[PDB]
Design a protein around this ligand. Sequence first.
Ligand SMILES: NC(=O)c1ccc[n+]([C@@H]2O[C@H](COP(=O)([O-])OP(=O)(O)OC[C@H]3O[C@@H](n4cnc5c(N)ncnc54)[C@H](OP(=O)(O)O)[C@@H]3O)[C@@H](O)[C@H]2O)c1
Length: 316
Amino acid sequence: MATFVELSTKAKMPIVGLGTWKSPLGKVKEAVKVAIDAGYRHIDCAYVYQNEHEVGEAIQEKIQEKAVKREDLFIVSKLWPTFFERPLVRKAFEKTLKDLKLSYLDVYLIHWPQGFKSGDDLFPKDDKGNAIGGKATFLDAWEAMEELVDEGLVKALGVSNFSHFQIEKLLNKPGLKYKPVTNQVECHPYLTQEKLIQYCHSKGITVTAYSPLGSPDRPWAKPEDPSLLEDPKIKEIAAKHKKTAAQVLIRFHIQRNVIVIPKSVTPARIVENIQVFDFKLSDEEMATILSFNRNWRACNVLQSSHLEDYPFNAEY
Ligand SMILES: NC(=O)c1ccc[n+]([C@@H]2O[C@H](COP(=O)([O-])OP(=O)(O)OC[C@H]3O[C@@H](n4cnc5c(N)ncnc54)[C@H](OP(=O)(O)O)[C@@H]3O)[C@@H](O)[C@H]2O)c1
């Protein structure tokens, strides 16, 4: 059982959640089942992961067997950028809700600020693999998502992979009924997101950290790419508390009041990843970790720097 972070809607969002990116079918259902048993009350989902139907089976099992009540679960999913056109936001949202077997979501995020070519080709690209843009923007999608909140099919909306520039574009839209409650971005000691976090909090927006362990199993990894779990300075700090480097990397976010969503389908690691409320990193250990900032992204896979709202060019 965890601390939470309060949203501007006064809803309470569990500070540690289970990530499900790349969680295979046949493993993800058991993954969710172990996490809930382990005290995870927050599960992070997406249409684009193409496994929400199996996540929905697991959640439903545990509500059935009285292990957890819906009101105490905090379920998040994401709208993919080939569905920014208006009838498609509703259709994409309905498939997510149906696969998840839920009556409502706690938060619905814009997964990526750049519209891609509309439709169920989720990664439209040219011959060189560059993203094919669509004409609908994240503003068009937000307007459509706002309807879902009006209807009580979504408690709150948020953003993911937004720069402060694109949040400014959102917050400064005339006519906006709802603001985002969170901005979910990659964050870890190599990419500490200090300005963006300071920006989002100043605006009442929480931050959710994905890839907190450096997403080591990412298929596109180079052996030259730095590894956080094998980092001696991260390992020194883990040794001090007799915890794992992984436990240190998750706790780092908790002590910044940043929500963090480590992904696992391995039961022993799922449990390990939430045993982070019986120790504390010192201000000096925290400052050492923050010094490791390299401005290095493990996830920069969409070859899309050529379309309009690219988030990663900007300083923050
Ligand atoms: N908003 C976005 O743009 C976006 C994009 C992608 C993902 N996400 C979300 O963020 C979540 C998590 O981030 P991520 O999947 O990028 O990478 P991550 O959570 O940093 O790392 C996942 C990898 O670390 C392993 N691992 C987990 N716990 C470990 C431990 N205690 N010791 C050693 N290894 C451990 C996992 O292995 P096993 O799984 O084999 O145990 C997996 O290979 C995703 O599941 C997804 O829900 C968001």
